[PDB]
Amino acid sequence: EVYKGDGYKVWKLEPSLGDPLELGRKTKTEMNAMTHDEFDRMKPSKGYDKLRVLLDLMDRPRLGTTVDLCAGRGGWSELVKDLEGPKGITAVSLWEEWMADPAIHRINANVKHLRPWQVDTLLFDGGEAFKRDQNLRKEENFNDSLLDAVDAWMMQPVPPRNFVIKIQVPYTQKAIALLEKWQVKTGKGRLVRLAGDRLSNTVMYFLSVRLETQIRGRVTTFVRELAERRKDRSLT
Ligand SMILES: Nc1ncnc2c1ncn2[C@@H]1O[C@H](CSCC[C@H](N)C(=O)O)[C@@H](O)[C@H]1O
């Protein structure tokens, strides 16, 4: 249909030439130098609605046994509970703080330590944008390490049938390599940029929809496009 397709709710991202790490660092550098005004112009929980959009993009799959990594205040877990009941949903976070249905089973643990188990659905909403005063590599390394935690859940003998994985910094070499590997492991997976996400971040989501390859070139298109739209939204 005109709805099922796009680029209505996600950006159109065809592969393009270029180095996504260099372009990503470039537009991060540009954004760090913006005035308060420029940055403003460009700039149980809200995640609930976010996941709704994402799960609708995936044609509303049956979720079954679900683990929600970095569950935070619980918007995603609450959405799963409303969709299918509290029986199949497990939330993992370091407890900030739980705003969701208290009947949802929760584990207070660091997702980097916890050994994975077999799930039907894998959710991950970890990641943090760093503020301007830091060396760029600190944000890159922090979010890379977080995604590495997701790797063990993806690479187990029976991988998740559904997954929604947030990629905070999609242009690092490790992020791209991980996404390519999960595509080989699962035979699935597409990286999307939500239309209407803030331009002040670089967030994409890896969804278990039909395989879409050439992730590196599409991340390049995404970072170039993002740099353009950040520039556009300037005074005067
Ligand atoms: N290493 C880690 N282990 C477990 N949780 C972590 C973590 N690093 C960050 N987090 C947690 O992950 C959460 C991500 S915010 C996720 C919000 C949630 N999806 C919602 O809709 O409400 C934060 O609350 C943070 O406390």
From TrEMBL:
Locations listed in the record: Host nucleus
Residues reported in the UniProt entry to bind S-adenosyl-L-methionine: S45, G75, W76, N110, V111
Segments crossing the lipid bilayer: none
Binding-site residues for S-adenosyl-L-homocysteine, renumbered to this chain: S45, G74, G75, W76, E96, N110, V111
Superkingdom of origin: Viruses
Record's protein name: NS5-like protein
Organism annotation: Alongshan virus
Shown stretch of the complete protein: 42 to 294 of 914
